[PDB]
């Protein structure tokens, strides 16, 4: 890797600089470099890694959705034939997106997950694994679609089982996981009832645990709770 010759601490420092400059591709490349040094990531470093790739693939997904919409319209009755260009460019963006998901999944498999023993790290990495299989599933149309969807579900489920045993209901990682798995159910698995049930139960169990928190922990937990409420309002 092109980051092989750079110090781990230098990579983390530059990832933070790239974040400030809103240079997410750079951020991601720095954090990939840091992961590949082979040491475990701290809490802060895990967050830098997730922020970087979330931003890169988030951009790609938005672009893919624009291009897909254009492509769908082109395949409607009455639409004039414009050639292969829209499909080719959607495919180009898709392939790049898949490439980034494969990279992230690569990092988690080699070897972030197998070394993650604490609940906060293992739940976090398994949530990411769920997420990047979910993005792959968004663009999947072939023989492997079902297996991709199940790979997402399996990762999310393992994260869920750990989170319920080892973390309080207000833990931001536990909350974030539940939020995303609930979206997985709604948007990928065609299970809107499961999506709603999950969001609701997660919200309610968190509400009942807020009394145990400091002001700052309260702020963190309630932020994510409002996102669960936002999704419930969208769906009901």
């Amino acid at each position: 890797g092109a980051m092989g010759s750079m110090e781990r601490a230098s990579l983390i420092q530059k990832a933070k600089l790239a974040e400030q400059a809103e240079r997410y591709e750079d951020m991601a490349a720095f954090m990939k470099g840091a992961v590949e040094k082979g040491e475990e990531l701290s809490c802060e470093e895990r967050n830098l890694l997730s922020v970087a790739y979330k931003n890169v693939v988030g951009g790609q997904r938005a672009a893919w959705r624009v291009l897909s919409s254009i492509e769908q319209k082109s395949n409607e009755e009455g639409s004039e034939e414009k050639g292969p260009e829209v499909r080719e460019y959607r495919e180009k963006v898709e392939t790049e997106l898949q490439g980034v998901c494969d990279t992230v999944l690569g990092l988690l498999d080699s070897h972030l997950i197998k070394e993650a023993g604490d609940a906060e790290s293992r739940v976090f990495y398994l949530k990411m694994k769920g997420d990047y299989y979910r993005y792959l599933a968004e663009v999947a149309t072939g023989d492997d679609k079902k297996r991709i969807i199940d790979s997402a579900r399996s990762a999310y489920q393992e994260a869920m089982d750990i989170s319920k045993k080892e973390m309080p209901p207000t833990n931001p990682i536990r909350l974030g996981l539940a939020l995303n798995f609930s979206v997985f159910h709604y948007e990928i698995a065609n299970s809107p009832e499961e999506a709603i049930s999950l969001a609701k139960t997660t919200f309610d169990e968190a509400m009942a645990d807020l009394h145990t928190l400091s002001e700052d922990s309260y702020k963190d937990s309630t932020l994510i709770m409002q996102l669960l409420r936002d999704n419930l309002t969208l769906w009901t």
């Binding site: 997420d131 939020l179 995303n180 979206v183 948007e187 996102l227 936002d230 769906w235």
Partner: peptide, 5 residues
């Protein structure tokens, strides 16, 4: 689209 983090 729905909220994710």
């Amino acid at each position: 689209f729905p909220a994710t983090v």
